[PDB]
């Protein structure tokens, strides 16, 4: 009667009712190869050369710095 | 009207007298859905809710 | 919530249908996240075996998911404005910030499509040509979830 | 502090209430009032009445200075009334015996199976449920298992059969650990014939109710070899011969093939 | 069988292999529904003929049919819980038939002392089925699975503790009876062979 447990009425049976609890129940290498080129491109971006306010001259200076970094890493 | 009772609450006669929802491989059991839950939300929890009187909410 | 859904099921069982309808157990829905990066630089290719795409999936940062979900950052911004947003408070690289293509399963969902490809920057015009189809494939994959 | 009422630091603290309030006096001396510091009596003075003052100070200092039978009856009546061991253990947890008599509880478990002509798994399942509810029944079962190995020879053949089925149903069901099983020593000099028959029946029930490759897996793991070295000494090799021929003459063989090659190369 | 073997309350025969002497299977044992139908009809015959039958003879009819069914089945009884419900109901119905033969249905006037006293002591000595606790579990998952025991219900309201002894704790199980029978008869065969050989 309580929850889905127990007989619904003791009038039909000869029991009194009194349902009760059972107490007795127990209770990546290609990623690294790409990351080397990513560090190369990070050095290329960190070269920048946006202080001399140049165009192709700043691009050539950044390419010189990038080839210097490639020679230093290689 | 739905024939379950509180242990402190009184008991009565039954008023009325396969499903794949009862599949064990589609039912996750974490907390038991007890009497109080089915009383408080009868359309949510009791299939065939007939002559059910909805309770007041929190004043 | 449970009271809301009990009211909906009561309205269905009483007004909007006269039929007694069985109800299963209430559960919740989940999402999918990752812990570590994709250990394989994994690829697929088109049914005409010419176009070969290689990509890895990695975890995102802390505030980025809720920022995209609250639309703090938008793809409707400028790419430089998005890069400044990712570089001031999230301290990203500017190349990785300009590499961002799309956001999640929907409009501004919490997945970041970074396209940073130095071997495939030699055909970046073709990469931008296939960028949109890569975006709908990414949106469909993050929409479904495997 | 006002909300807690100074519960952690009350005004009434232990170690300072050494004076009676009836002997003490309550006087209100305010700070704004003319409160005398009373430095006159603090220092010593050359009073002319010093002998009378010393006599008054000395006078002030002198003034201030059976149930076990009813236990058996209740246990046996609950056992014979209970249809299932689940109902029996639930009834025993309902009636709530103290833990000072858990060894007596194990005693009237073993005796109630010892009275049986044929072994029933009711008492073994009750013993396993007692092991798997609380640990103290399991420790009492371990201690009474060592004591039963100490007192094998007091019991008859069907009694020792039932007790061997108890210790089997503790061990193939893993209700007892195998660590307490180092009390058994496979030594023909010291162990009794009843002890050998007991060990034979217990291992026969093990080999019946669970498999022999699984039994060799349970018997050849290195962690319980400190508890198997009493059973498997591989030393004083006539005892190794006794163990080989004992586990062969039970009907098994097999378990002492390692002991057989030990006897071969040693 | 998944997990491991099932340590069961004697209503599952662990099936020993003839060769390896090992349990290789399990035989779950239950009672046929027509057996409870025939037993309930036997109790219905008892109450049918109870209109002109003395109380001691009624207790004899009850005890005879009860020990016949119980000694026939033994081990499979504990797996059939509706048999226990029928036993409790039929025990209460024959006690109610005693309360109909007398003109009182007062439970204080009818304690179990008047029923469970043996007739050697001037009582009745009707046997003890329903002073136990019915195991209770989920009615949703009872039809689908086997979920163990979660709760207990009383058989009938008796005077507090009682501890009236159940008959299944005096009848031996069938598997133990068969195993001890084979062991005893083999030992008797060796004893008879030795008696022939020594001519002793």
In 3D space, the residue among B47, A22, D100 whose CA is nearest the CA of residue C9 turns out to be B47
Which residue of C lies nearest to B46 if distances are taken between CA atoms?
Answer: C23
Tell me how long chain C is.
146
Write the CB contacts of A6 (distance below 8 Å, at least 6 apart in sequence). Answer: A17, A19, E136, E151, E153
* B7 within 8 A of A2, measured Cβ to Cβ: yes
In 3D space, the residue among C113, C120, C119 whose CA is nearest the CA of residue C98 turns out to be C113
DSSP 3-state helix, strand, coil percentages of chain C (rounded to 5)?
40, 10, 50
In 3D space, the residue among D182, D102, D197 whose CA is nearest the CA of residue D144 turns out to be D102
CB < 8 Å & 24+ apart, contacts of D57-60: none
Task: Measure the CA–CA gap between C11 and B52, rounded to whole angstroms.
Answer: 14
Q: Could you say which of C41, C95, C118 has the minimum Cβ distance to residue A30?
A: C41
Q: For residue D123, which residues of chain E lie inside 8 Å, CB to CB?
A: none
Residue D51, CB half-sphere, CA atoms under 13 Å: how many?
0
Which residue of A lies nearest to B34 if distances are taken between CA atoms?
Answer: A3
The interface residues of chain E toward chain D in range 68-107, judged by CB-CB distance below 8 A, are 78, 84
- SS3 sequence of chain D: CCCCCCCCCCCCCCCCCCCCCCCCCCCCCCCCCCCCCCCCCCCCCCCCCHHHHHHHHHHHHHHHCCHHHHHHHHHHHHHHHCCCHHHHHHHHHHHCCCHHHHHHHHHHHHHHHHCCCCCCHHHHHHHHHHHHHCHHHHHHHHHHHHHHHHCCCCCCHHHHHHHHHHHHHHHCCCCCCCHHHHHCCCCCCCCCHHHHHHHHHHHHHHHHHCCHHHHHHHHCCHHHHHHHCCCCCCCCHHHHHHHHHHHHHCCCCCCCHHHHHHHHHC
* C100 within 8 A of C91, measured Cβ to Cβ: no
Experimental method: cryo-EM
List chain C gaps (C–N > 2.5 A) by preceding residue.
none
* C36 contacts chain A (CB < 8 A): no
Burial of E151 (0-12, 13-18, 19+ CB in 10 A): buried
In 3D space, the residue among D157, D234, D169 whose CA is nearest the CA of residue D196 turns out to be D157
In 3D space, the residue among D106, D112, D103 whose CA is nearest the CA of residue D80 turns out to be D112
What is the DSSP track for E82-107?
A: HHHHHHHHHHHHHHHHHHHHTT---T
Residue E23 host element (H or E): strand E23-28
Label the pairing between strands C52-55 and C42-45: antiparallel
Query: In angstroms, how far is CA D257 from the centroid of its own chain?
Result: 38
Q: Please answer yes or no on whether A23 and D129 come within 8 Å at the CB atom.
A: no
* E86 within 8 A of E40, measured Cβ to Cβ: yes
In 3D space, the residue among B53, B42, B52 whose CA is nearest the CA of residue B16 turns out to be B52
Looking up tokens 């005004």 gives: D11
Q: Residue-wise over C34-60: b if at least 16 C-beta within 10 A, else e? A: eeeeeeeeeeeeeeeeeeeeeeeeeee
Which residue of A lies nearest to B14 if distances are taken between CA atoms?
Answer: A8
Task: Measure the CA–CA gap between D130 and D111, rounded to whole angstroms.
Answer: 16
- What is the dihedral sign for C-alpha C13, C16, C19, C24? negative
Residues linked to residue E28 through DSSP beta bridges, in sequence order: E12
What phi and psi values does residue E174 have, to the nearest 5 degrees? -70, -40
Distance from CA of E88 to the nearest CA of A (A): 7
Which residue of E lies nearest to A11 if distances are taken between CA atoms?
Answer: E89
Burial of E104 (0-12, 13-18, 19+ CB in 10 A): exposed
Rg (CA), chain A: 40
Q: For residue E143, which residues of chain B lie inside 8 Å, CB to CB?
A: 22
What phi and psi values does residue D194 have, to the nearest 5 degrees? -65, -35
Q: Residue-wise over E113-130: b if at least 16 C-beta within 10 A, else e? A: eebbeeeeeeebbbbbbb
* A48 within 8 A of A62, measured Cβ to Cβ: yes
* C57 within 8 A of C34, measured Cβ to Cβ: yes
Which residue of A lies nearest to E96 if distances are taken between CA atoms?
Answer: A14
Measured in Å, how far apart are chain E's first and last C-alpha atoms? Answer: 51
In 3D space, the residue among D77, D84, D127 whose CA is nearest the CA of residue D107 turns out to be D127
* B56 contacts chain C (CB < 8 A): no
- How is residue D143 written in tokens? 């201690």
Which residue of A lies nearest to B13 if distances are taken between CA atoms?
Answer: A9
Q: Please answer yes or no on whether E133 and D90 come within 8 Å at the CB atom.
A: yes
- What is the dihedral sign for C-alpha C28, C33, C39, C44? positive
Distance from CA of E8 to the nearest CA of D (A): 8
* D128 within 8 A of D175, measured Cβ to Cβ: yes
Q: For residue A4, which residues of chain E lie inside 8 Å, CB to CB?
A: 138-140
Distance from CA of B57 to the nearest CA of A (A): 22
Q: For residue A31, which residues of chain C lie inside 8 Å, CB to CB?
A: 37, 41, 56
What are the Cα distances from residue D199, in Å, to C8, C18, D167, D226? 68, 71, 10, 19
Task: Measure the CA–CA gap between D216 and A66, rounded to whole angstroms.
Answer: 68
Q: For residue E140, which residues of chain A lie inside 8 Å, CB to CB?
A: 4
Q: For residue E141, which residues of chain B lie inside 8 Å, CB to CB?
A: 22, 24
Tell me which chains share at least 3 CB pairs under 8 Å with chain C.
Answer: A, B
* A33 within 8 A of E174, measured Cβ to Cβ: no
Q: Please answer yes or no on whether C9 and B21 come within 8 Å at the CB atom.
A: no
Q: Residue-wise over D42-69: b if at least 16 C-beta within 10 A, else e? A: eeeeeeeeeeeeeeeeeeeeeeeeeeee
Cα dihedral: D85, D90, D92, D97 (round 10): 140
Burial of D254 (0-12, 13-18, 19+ CB in 10 A): middle
Q: Please answer yes or no on whether C3 and B41 come within 8 Å at the CB atom.
A: yes
Q: Please answer yes or no on whether C41 and A45 come within 8 Å at the CB atom.
A: no
Measured in Å, how far apart are chain D's first and last C-alpha atoms? Answer: 80
Q: Please answer yes or no on whether B27 and C20 come within 8 Å at the CB atom.
A: no
């Amino acid at each position: 009667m309580y929850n889905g447990i127990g007989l619904p009425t003791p009038r039909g049976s000869g029991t009194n009712g009194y349902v009760q609890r059972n107490l007795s129940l127990v209770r990546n290498p290609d990623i690294l190869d790409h990351e080397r080129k990513r560090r190369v491109e990070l050095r290329c971006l960190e070269l920048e050369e946006m202080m001399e306010e140049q165009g192709y001259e700043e691009q050539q200076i950044q390419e010189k710095v990038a080839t210097f970094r490639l020679m230093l890493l290689e | 009207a739905l024939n379950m009772a509180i242990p402190g609450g009184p008991k009565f006669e039954p008023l009325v007298r396969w499903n794949e929802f009862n599949d064990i491989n589609k039912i996750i059991i974490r907390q038991p859905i007890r009497t109080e839950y089915k009383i408080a939300f009868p359309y949510l929890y009791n299939n065939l809710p007939h002559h059910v009187h909805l309770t007041w909410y929190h004043t | 919530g449970e009271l809301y859904l009990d009211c909906v099921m009561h309205d269905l069982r009483k007004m909007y249908s006269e039929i007694d309808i069985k109800v299963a157990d209430p559960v919740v829905t989940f999402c999918e996240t990752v812990v570590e990066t994709s250990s394989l630089k994994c690829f697929a290719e088109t049914p005409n075996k010419k176009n070969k795409i290689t990509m890895i999936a990695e975890p995102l940062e802390k505030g980025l998911a809720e920022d995209i979900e609250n639309e703090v950052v938008q793809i409707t911004w400028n790419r430089k404005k998005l890069g400044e947003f990712f570089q001031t408070k999230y301290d990203w690289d500017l190349l990785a910030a300009r590499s961002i293509w799309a956001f999640g399963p929907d409009a501004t969902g919490p997945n970041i499509l970074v396209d940073d490809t130095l071997p495939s920057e030699v055909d970046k015009a073709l990469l931008g040509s296939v960028k949109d189809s890569i975006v709908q494939g990414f949106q469909w994959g993050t929409r479904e979830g495997p | 502090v006002r909300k807690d009422g100074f519960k952690d630091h009350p005004i009434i603290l232990e170690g300072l209430d050494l004076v009676e309030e009836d002997d003490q006096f309550t006087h209100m001396l305010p700070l704004e009032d003319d409160y005398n510091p009373e430095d006159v009596l603090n220092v010593f003075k050359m009073d002319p009445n010093f002998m009378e003052n010393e006599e008054k100070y000395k006078a002030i200092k002198k003034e201030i200075l059976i149930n076990l039978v009813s236990f058996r009856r209740t246990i046996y009546l609950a056992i014979q009334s209970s249809l299932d061991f689940e109902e029996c253990a639930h009834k025993l947890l309902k009636m709530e015996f103290p833990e000072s008599q858990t060894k007596e509880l194990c005693n009237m478990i073993l005796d109630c199976c010892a009275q049986q002509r044929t072994y029933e798994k009711f008492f073994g399942l009750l013993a396993g449920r007692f092991c798997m509810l609380k640990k103290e029944y399991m420790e009492s079962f371990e201690g009474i298992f060592k004591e039963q190995y100490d007192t094998i020879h007091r019991l008859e053949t069907n009694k020792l059969r039932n007790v061997a089925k108890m210790f089997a149903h503790l061990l193939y069901t893993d209700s007892l650990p195998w660590s307490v099983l180092e009390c058994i020593k496979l030594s023909e000099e010291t162990t009794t014939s009843s002890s050998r028959i007991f060990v034979k029946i217990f291992f026969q029930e093990l080999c019946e109710y669970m498999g022999l490759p699984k039994l060799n897996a349970r018997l050849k793991d290195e962690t319980l070899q400190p508890f198997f070295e009493g059973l498997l000494p591989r030393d004083n090799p006539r005892n190794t011969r006794f163990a080989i021929n004992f586990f062969t003459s039970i009907g098994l063989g097999g378990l002492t093939d390692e002991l057989r090659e030990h006897l071969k190369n040693t | 069988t998944s997990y491991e073997e099932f340590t069961h309350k004697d209503g599952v025969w662990n099936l020993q292999n003839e060769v390896t002497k090992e349990r290789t299977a399990q035989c779950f044992l239950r009672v046929d529904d027509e057996s409870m139908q025939r037993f309930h009809n036997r109790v219905r015959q008892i109450l049918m003929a109870s209109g002109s039958t003395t109380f001691t003879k009624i207790v004899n009819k009850w005890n005879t049919a009860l020990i016949g069914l119980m000694t026939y089945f033994r081990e499979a009884v504990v797996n059939t819980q509706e048999l226990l419900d029928l036993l409790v109901k039929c025990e209460n119905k024959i006690q109610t038939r005693i309360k109909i033969g007398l003109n009182s249905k007062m439970p204080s006037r009818f304690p179990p002392v008047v029923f469970y006293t043996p007739k050697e002591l001037g009582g009745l000595g009707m046997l003890s089925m329903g002073h136990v606790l019915i195991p209770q579990s989920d009615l949703r998952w009872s039809k689908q699975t086997d979920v163990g025991i979660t709760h207990f219900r009383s058989g009938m309201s008796h005077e507090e503790d009682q501890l009236i002894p159940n008959l299944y704790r005096y009848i031996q199980p069938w598997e133990s009876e068969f195993i001890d029978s084979q062991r005893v008869w083999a030992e008797y065969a060796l004893k008879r062979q030795e008696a022939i050989a020594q001519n002793r």
